Design a protein around this ligand. Structure first.
Ligand SMILES: *[C@@H]1O[C@H](CO)[C@@H](O[C@@H]2O[C@H](CO)[C@@H](O)[C@H](O)[C@H]2NC(C)=O)[C@H](O)[C@H]1NC(C)=O
Ligand SMILES: CC1(C)CC(NC(=O)CCCCC[C@@H]2SC[C@@H]3NC(=O)N[C@@H]32)CC(C)(C)N1O
Ligand SMILES: CC1(C)CC(NC(=O)CCCCC[C@@H]2SC[C@@H]3NC(=O)N[C@@H]32)CC(C)(C)N1O
Ligand SMILES: CC1(C)CC(NC(=O)CCCCC[C@@H]2SC[C@@H]3NC(=O)N[C@@H]32)CC(C)(C)N1O
Ligand SMILES: CC1(C)CC(NC(=O)CCCCC[C@@H]2SC[C@@H]3NC(=O)N[C@@H]32)CC(C)(C)N1O
Ligand SMILES: *[C@@H]1O[C@H](CO)[C@@H](O)[C@H](O)[C@H]1NC(C)=O
Ligand SMILES: *[C@@H]1O[C@H](CO)[C@@H](O)[C@H](O)[C@H]1NC(C)=O
Ligand SMILES: *[C@@H]1O[C@H](CO)[C@@H](O)[C@H](O)[C@H]1NC(C)=O
Ligand code: NA
Ligand code: NA
Ligand code: NA
Ligand code: NA
Ligand SMILES: [Zn+2]
Ligand SMILES: [Zn+2]
Ligand SMILES: [Zn+2]
Ligand SMILES: [Zn+2]
Lengths: 111, 121, 119, 121
């Protein structure tokens, strides 16, 4: 169960994760189906079914999304990425901060 | 302007140091949490994240991952670099703390959520 | 898309939502299919309200008062209709664990989703 | 010893009043939000929740829904009643704000999250 490869989630978004170095660091591109491509950066815990997390630095909005989850192996043997994300929006005054963070899930399978 | 480069501390007492943010918003840093839950020892862990460059906002959004060096878990933060009314820089963040579970059926319980406020140290 | 009825979620949990009165208030029971405690699962009550402002697909929220654990879970979502006319309860929940000292609060809340269909 | 009955105020400046908590831990009350993002005039809204009764812990957990009367949204709070070193009662809570979207395809963006700290008013 390694994050490298092409992934697709329930919303139809695509994700491509490059190589994961010894420290667990990886890069990739994120193709969002709902709102376009944007780079992503994250690391995977090193110490089989590891936990991971990455940031998606969007290039068509001021927002930032972070994903985190675990690489599982289904009963049938397929790799499944079960993750949750926080989508931070850009507010002007810090008084509007209470409404800036959304939350949700995404399930990825090998594209 | 509010830049993440610097040394920060949050309401739990954890300390965070963020290096330089390059022309694309990518940065790296270390995280020294004040709290834990594992049987192992607390250790300065690396963090990798990015800062939004769209419009070069003076209060941009950001998000980074903390790859813990003593726990099997992973934590992701995201928030906004804010400038107070007095003029002090403050980070308003929310984090997800993914736990490691061997059963994919145990996945429903492997994600904690919380907040964190950061100021310069 | 009324909440009244019996529902089942992706985790295999069942919940029966009684009648929703004029103000949107409703009561019911929740039979969770999963737990990590050592205690035996036990049907627990739920109390929640439904938004009446204006709808075909209203937003709602309800608390589950667990009777076998010291914790508390709250759900909130929207009643949707599919392309095949099927009712779906898309929800997210916050699971509050009981901690000893307020200092241990940071690690007390879990988060997740649950999709419901009529049983 | 830490009961939710009484009038509370949060870090945002909002106020709520929690009536009586019965044997089963059920309770109702009122919530007057201090902030909002709709131009509709903020209108006092009812709330329904329940307190955990297992073991009658001095610091129980709780949750309640707030049925907004001036918006199509719903917010759920869950937390714990604490007694700090000083002796004051505090409510540590996290909330989900479910927005009303038209189609089920917009559902992914209909739930916000945050915290609130309440102290007796
Ligand atoms: C939710 O309800 C369904 C149906 O009412 C339950 O399904 C039954 O589960 C038992 C347990 O193994 C089986 O022996 C029955 O054959 C099932 N019946 C049907 C019609 O499927 C289900 O167990 C309930 N879930 C929980 C957690 O109680
Ligand atoms: C709510 C919304 C639309 C959020 C902001 N969206 C964007 O900027 C588009 C880029 C992010 C969308 C991808 C998310 S990310 C998690 C989820 N998982 C997945 O695969 N796609 C989705 C824009 C503003 C703030 C204006 N509004 O508010
Ligand atoms: C044991 C297990 C599964 C793992 C725990 N991981 C740790 O102990 C590593 C220490 C770093 C975490 C610090 C968090 S990170 C966000 C917040 N902000 C801050 O500064 N500290 C806290 C976690 C849990 C409780 C899930 N359990 O217990
Ligand atoms: C830490 C842990 C394992 C988690 C919590 N476990 C419980 O609360 C007991 C089981 C009842 C909760 C059912 C949830 S609710 C959302 C999800 N959706 C669904 O259908 N079931 C699940 C708290 C404590 C600390 C007791 N334990 O220990
Ligand atoms: C504008 C719209 C569609 C509706 C908004 N609904 C409202 O205006 C109704 C009242 C808001 C409740 C106040 C929250 S509740 C948790 C927190 N604790 C507290 O005391 N206040 C805040 C919501 C948003 C802006 C998301 N969307 O966009
Ligand atoms: C994802 O990849 C598949 C296969 O290449 C393609 O059919 C689909 O259109 C892609 N979706 C997006 C949003 O790029
Ligand atoms: C953070 O730094 C300050 C000053 O350098 C120090 O007093 C404090 O103990 C540090 N906290 C942690 C958790 O390392
Ligand atoms: C909450 O109560 C205080 C106490 O007087 C009051 O000043 C404040 O206006 C109240 N909040 C709102 C939103 O009315
Ligand atoms: Na504003
Ligand atoms: Na298990
Ligand atoms: Na403690
Ligand atoms: Na739409
Ligand atoms: Zn990059
Ligand atoms: Zn690294
Ligand atoms: Zn009850
Ligand atoms: Zn009511």
């Amino acid at each position: 169960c390694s994050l490298t490869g092409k992934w697709t989630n329930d919303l139809g978004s695509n994700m491509t994760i490059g190589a994961v170095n010894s420290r667990g660091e990886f890069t990739g591109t994120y193709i969002t189906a709902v709102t376009k491509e944007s780079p992503l950066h994250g690391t995977q815990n090193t110490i089989t079914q590891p936990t991971f997390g990455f940031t998606v630095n969007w290039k068509f909005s001021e927002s930032t999304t972070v994903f985190t989850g675990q690489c599982f192996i289904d009963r049938n043997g397929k790799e499944v990425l079960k993750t949750m994300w926080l989508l931070r929006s850009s507010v002007n005054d810090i008084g509007d901060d209470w409404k800036a963070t959304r939350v949700g899930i995404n399930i990825f399978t090998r594209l």
